[PDB]
Point group: D3
Chain length 147, copies 6
């Protein structure tokens, strides 16, 4: 049973969609026990987007830089988040489209039971469109996995 | 070029991730020129989710009840939103899973140029999991289409 | 190398798209060695479409009624054709859509080399849309396989 | 309700499949109000196919060169057409296959109701096969969208 | 780094494909620390296949019957295993096909490092074909996930 | 009806999951009427995997080098096998992952009836993971097609 005050997806997105400067949200989340990561990436290569999120997450300590288990968890969460962004074909450049994304990676236990352990949410928000500036619309994606 | 203050996708999600009995968000969006629709639907059948959204959108005036054009725009936007929710296979019950969703449909021009016309954003947020309460996690979906 | 005058795909589609009350196009195709099957099926169930095509193909003798080999070839060609019709998710009713289709199944050798043997083409044309009539547009699909 | 004499999909495919050295089928379509674009592209890169179609459609005036709305409509119709050609994975060269395509893009209102406005159809026909010539079969795809 | 003597996928499959009677393999695996589950399921409903594997796994203690975390791990492994079986469309009956499967669920650490924790492999083997006995060919699928 | 002692899929996997320097499995299979091919390939490009299999199959005599028919059968069998390996998106490098595979291709009649002709099974087994050694898990894929 998800804890209303700990809905990892909702929190990662509210953080991702907030454009305030005086921004205590990251601090607030961390104070509540969440591991947080924020970044940006623009590319016509999906592998670069995956690479950016992975690197940023490991450098911020959201997931372990050693071992495979957590990288595996993150990879599949990223893949799922990319589904909402690509909608059908997980291809960007090869389908003549590119993305300008902001991404948030949030790690923690979103349930009332401590036995559920840590879960990770990968949220993406930005634009997807032609290689030409302006010709685009928004894109969104949230992937959640146990970790 | 997307108008910074009229990012329909971002606005539709934020509207959905809001939990203030007295937000006045809907009215505020309507006063800014947006046609807004909110609803909820729980089911193991994707077709019931699609139908709820279409019914709510037509009843609220978000899209014309007559003609195919707007219904077509909404259907595809709904399909794109379902991609983020289903991530790979647009199936619920047949894959032994179910959803509990809140949905928002916004309709207006998110671009700086009036020539871009109206666009529609279907946003979904809730849970997806086994038919058993508690065994589930969050799910998001955002589809954007022109009208 | 495809024989210019034996393009099984093109031929099956021309037959499918041309309303010839007279001048049996089927007779001409058969006179040239092609085995031909034509039919129509309307449904919100893809399995009924697949079934209609199989039954009609076997009844007309386009594929053997006994054995698996030929049914296997036909099934896959049918699946490939359905991809053009469904465009992403091979689902109809579960996604609140229905099809009204006319289908053609052609069998013969479309290559200059006789050693290539028989191939089969399954072609579909009609409409796909909401259950309510009027809300729909055209749909097409062609699947080709060796047999 | 689709106008029997204005089936944009069927018309785009007939144009595509019929080799008319004389009697300009294009002139007749244009005389009836349709905006038409024809072209050919051979490649192992789907983005070049998409690009060829967009450039040709804009050059011929089938869709506006400025703005995003119409390019958006065309892009999605192109994607839908590619589904019939690729049947599962919208990949060409990365899966060791290449296409030789002829394409047609038609724009007009295919419905009895003038209120429906313009719709667009992207149709593709040609071959798909191994890089080595001779090893290939036909491929088709039709995408329809409102614009 | 995978441990050659502990390759969870390979082991689950060798167990699944072994048709011996005097069968000490399950005992051998369990003696080595693996949690093992074996079953059979024939159906035209993918949800029944997923249901069978889940139930069998929980009744055999391969995964916890309480909580969501492990059910989540198993569900996604099952989904991945089903990809090899369905190859493109995770649909059975709706696409007029059915399966007769044997399944093995193996849980344990396949790496040299103990820090990798438990992983789960879901292996499927049997036939997939028409609803008629005989008209079918073999099908295989292996899904691996951390747990 | 599949011949219990000639289950091509099962035989191809078992052949691949074997690690005896002196198994004599290949010769034993060839003496039972099967055409056999074994190979290995590591890459971040699916097209290189497809090419290795095709090259190995033609060089070993598993399929004819001339004509398209057998190449077509093999290509689709290879594609079906890749589904189990890629599970959803038939992409490797573009999704920042790579494979280290062993493959086996068997060709013969697995049915009790000689009228079913020859069929081909492409089996894949190895690892899929990040471009970094150690960060990966097992992957399987089996594709079956008629010739
Ligand atoms: N609109 C496309 C992106 C795009 C490509 N070219 C123009 N727009 C999408 O939904 O992904
Ligand atoms: N977790 C699954 C849903 C589910 C089914 N059973 C348990 N969970 C998903 O990502 O859709
Ligand atoms: N537009 C949908 C069909 C549809 C469903 N509802 C309305 N139209 C398609 O492209 O398949
Ligand atoms: N047969 C493949 C094309 C191909 C690749 N190599 C040989 N043929 C298809 O259906 O797309
Ligand atoms: N051969 C089909 C199954 C089938 C359905 N009907 C006959 N066979 C497959 O590859 O899944
Ligand atoms: N685990 C991924 C592969 C991978 C990429 N990076 C790490 N692992 C899969 O299931 O394909
Ligand atoms: Mg999940
Ligand atoms: Mg449509
Ligand atoms: Mg098959
Ligand atoms: Mg778009
Ligand atoms: Mg994995
Ligand atoms: Mg083919």
């Amino acid at each position: 049973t998800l804890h209303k005050e700990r809905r990892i997806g909702r929190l990662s997105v509210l953080l991702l969609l907030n454009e305030a400067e005086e921004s205590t949200q990251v601090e607030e989340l961390e104070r509540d026990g969440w591991k947080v990561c924020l970044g940006k990436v623009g590319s016509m290569d999906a592998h670069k987007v995956i690479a950016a999120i992975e690197t940023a997450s490991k450098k911020s300590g959201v997931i372990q830089s050693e071992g495979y288990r957590e990288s595996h968890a993150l990879y599949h969460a990223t893949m799922e988040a990319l589904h909402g962004v690509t909608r059908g074909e997980m291809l960007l450049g090869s389908l003549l489209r590119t993305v300008g994304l902001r991404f948030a990676v949030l790690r923690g236990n979103p349930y009332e039971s401590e036995a559920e352990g840590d879960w990770i949410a990968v949220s993406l928000y930005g634009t997807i469109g032609a290689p030409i500036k302006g010709l685009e619309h928004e894109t969104f994606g949230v992937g959640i996995n146990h970790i």
